[PDB]
Design an enzyme around this catalytic site. Structure first.
Site, PDB file in Angstrom:
ATOM      1  N   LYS A   1      42.017  39.725  34.931  1.00  0.00           N
ATOM      2  CA  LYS A   1      41.412  38.362  35.302  1.00  0.00           C
ATOM      3  C   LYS A   1      39.970  38.892  35.011  1.00  0.00           C
ATOM      4  O   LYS A   1      39.319  39.570  35.444  1.00  0.00           O
ATOM      5  CB  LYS A   1      41.680  38.382  36.668  1.00  0.00           C
ATOM      6  CG  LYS A   1      40.855  37.020  37.119  1.00  0.00           C
ATOM      7  CD  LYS A   1      41.481  35.678  37.060  1.00  0.00           C
ATOM      8  CE  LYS A   1      40.574  34.623  36.868  1.00  0.00           C
ATOM      9  NZ  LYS A   1      40.039  34.506  35.577  1.00  0.00           N
TER      10      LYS A   1
ATOM     11  N   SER B   1      34.718  34.560  38.684  1.00  0.00           N
ATOM     12  CA  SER B   1      36.159  34.071  38.806  1.00  0.00           C
ATOM     13  C   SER B   1      37.153  35.242  39.307  1.00  0.00           C
ATOM     14  O   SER B   1      38.352  34.845  39.631  1.00  0.00           O
ATOM     15  CB  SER B   1      36.639  33.462  37.344  1.00  0.00           C
ATOM     16  OG  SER B   1      35.972  32.409  36.924  1.00  0.00           O
TER      17      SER B   1
ATOM     18  N   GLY C   1      35.975  37.223  34.814  1.00  0.00           N
ATOM     19  CA  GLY C   1      34.920  36.127  35.323  1.00  0.00           C
ATOM     20  C   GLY C   1      33.600  36.345  34.713  1.00  0.00           C
ATOM     21  O   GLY C   1      33.438  37.064  33.947  1.00  0.00           O
TER      22      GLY C   1
HETATM   23  C1  NFF Z   1      34.809  31.528  37.007  1.00  0.00           C
HETATM   24  O1  NFF Z   1      33.714  32.746  36.189  1.00  0.00           O
HETATM   25  C2  NFF Z   1      34.389  30.301  35.815  1.00  0.00           C
HETATM   26  N1  NFF Z   1      32.964  30.510  35.315  1.00  0.00           N
HETATM   27  C3  NFF Z   1      32.174  29.115  35.415  1.00  0.00           C
HETATM   28  O2  NFF Z   1      32.760  28.251  35.677  1.00  0.00           O
HETATM   29  C4  NFF Z   1      30.792  29.533  35.186  1.00  0.00           C
HETATM   30  C5  NFF Z   1      29.958  29.467  36.094  1.00  0.00           C
HETATM   31  O3  NFF Z   1      30.484  29.296  37.444  1.00  0.00           O
HETATM   32  C6  NFF Z   1      29.401  28.929  38.514  1.00  0.00           C
HETATM   33  C7  NFF Z   1      30.022  27.697  39.117  1.00  0.00           C
HETATM   34  C8  NFF Z   1      28.463  29.713  35.898  1.00  0.00           C
HETATM   35  C9  NFF Z   1      27.938  29.741  34.697  1.00  0.00           C
HETATM   36  C10 NFF Z   1      29.185  29.947  33.622  1.00  0.00           C
HETATM   37  C11 NFF Z   1      28.555  29.968  32.219  1.00  0.00           C
HETATM   38  C12 NFF Z   1      29.603  30.195  31.172  1.00  0.00           C
HETATM   39  C13 NFF Z   1      30.986  30.065  31.297  1.00  0.00           C
HETATM   40  C14 NFF Z   1      31.036  29.797  32.624  1.00  0.00           C
HETATM   41  C15 NFF Z   1      30.314  29.741  33.670  1.00  0.00           C
HETATM   42  C16 NFF Z   1      35.459  30.414  34.535  1.00  0.00           C
HETATM   43  N2  NFF Z   1      35.754  31.916  34.481  1.00  0.00           N
HETATM   44  C17 NFF Z   1      35.530  32.384  33.162  1.00  0.00           C
HETATM   45  C18 NFF Z   1      36.015  33.582  33.011  1.00  0.00           C
HETATM   46  O4  NFF Z   1      35.460  34.512  32.042  1.00  0.00           O
HETATM   47  O5  NFF Z   1      37.150  33.967  33.418  1.00  0.00           O
HETATM   48  C19 NFF Z   1      35.580  31.376  31.792  1.00  0.00           C
HETATM   49  C20 NFF Z   1      36.909  31.039  31.781  1.00  0.00           C
HETATM   50  C21 NFF Z   1      34.608  31.598  30.926  1.00  0.00           C
HETATM   51  S1  NFF Z   1      35.042  29.872  32.907  1.00  0.00           S
END
Ligand code: NFF
Length: 256
Positions: free
Chosen positions: A199, A42, A201
């Site tokens: 920020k 993210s 991810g």
């Molecule tokens: C961006 O990292 C988001 N992450 C996810 O949606 C995400 C993922 O994305 C692939 C489509 C794959 C696996 C996981 C596993 C656990 C949580 C999220 C994912 C969002 N950003 C993250 C952040 O830390 O900023 C979040 C808020 C946990 S989700």
């Protein structure tokens, strides 16, 4: 030696860790795997919000964007409770940074426009700031990776530099200051009187990132990029926020 601590953390969490704090007046670069590739995750959303900010007049934040059921494909805590009304660019921006709203990100990319739903215009934005390393489009895989080093220099330029005019630089900065997701990472490894914007991810193969700008109690700034993954645990390995907090503590140490 600082790299022993880091290697220790990697052993403890069975992780690969990436750290980069660019040099300042009296401080040298802090670097550890600072040049290996790690997924973006993210974290791209921050420079993505700068991209959009840069690209448009500020009043463009008031343009209303509509989106439907099929537009919601990832974790989107804000885009869920709006889908009816719609959302403004500014609201999407707010959501992209502060809540890491995935739909918000996909709509802001689409706002940048061009091939690949905007990922080319996005990469273009990073090339313009001198980033030849990152690329938006599987541990190690080239696609959607950056390096602790490349991202930190990007954030430096966005928050502490002339990439965005003061008014727009401010808006970016504020959204990151009021991030809801980074409580347990870089934030947790710096004393309460250092002011930290970030920020985050998070992803599969135990990926967890945090990119931040920090200010010492007397207002001296530093960019802190922490990236990690844990391929050792396979696709469904858990992210370890602790590792990120700990690394930050070790970085807080050097800078205090
Ligand atoms: C961006 O990292 C988001 N992450 C996810 O949606 C995400 C993922 O994305 C692939 C489509 C794959 C696996 C996981 C596993 C656990 C949580 C999220 C994912 C969002 N950003 C993250 C952040 O830390 O900023 C979040 C808020 C946990 S989700």
């Amino acid at each position: 030696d600082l790299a022993d601590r880091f290697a220790e953390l990697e052993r403890r969490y069975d992780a690969r860790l990436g750290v980069y704090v660019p040099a300042t007046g009296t401080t040298a670069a802090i670097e550890y795997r600072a040049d290996e590739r790690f997924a973006f995750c993210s974290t791209f959303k921050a420079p993505l919000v700068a991209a959009v900010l840069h690209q448009n007049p500020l009043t463009h934040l008031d343009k209303l964007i509509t989106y439907t059921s099929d537009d919601i494909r990832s974790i989107s805590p804000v885009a869920q409770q709006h889908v009816q009304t719609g959302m403004t660019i500014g609201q999407l921006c707010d959501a992209a940074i502060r809540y890491s709203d995935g739909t918000a990100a996909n709509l802001l990319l689409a706002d940048l426009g061009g091939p690949g739903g905007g990922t080319a215009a996005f990469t273009g934005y990073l090339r313009s700031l001198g980033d030849t390393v990152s690329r938006l489009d599987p541990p190690g895989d080239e696609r959607d990776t950056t390096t602790p080093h490349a991202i930190a220099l990007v954030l430096q330029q966005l928050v502490l530099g002339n990439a965005l005019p003061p008014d727009k630089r401010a808006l970016l900065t504020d959204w990151m200051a009021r991030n809801t997701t980074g409580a347990k990472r870089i934030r947790a490894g710096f004393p309460a009187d250092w002011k930290v914007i970030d920020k985050t991810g998070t992803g599969d193969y135990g990926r967890a990132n945090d990119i931040a700008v920090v200010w010492s109690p007397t207002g001296v700034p530093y960019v802190v990029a922490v990236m990690s993954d844990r391929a050792g645990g396979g696709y469904d390995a858990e992210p370890r926020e602790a590792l990120l907090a700990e690394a930050a503590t070790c970085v807080a140490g050097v800078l205090a």
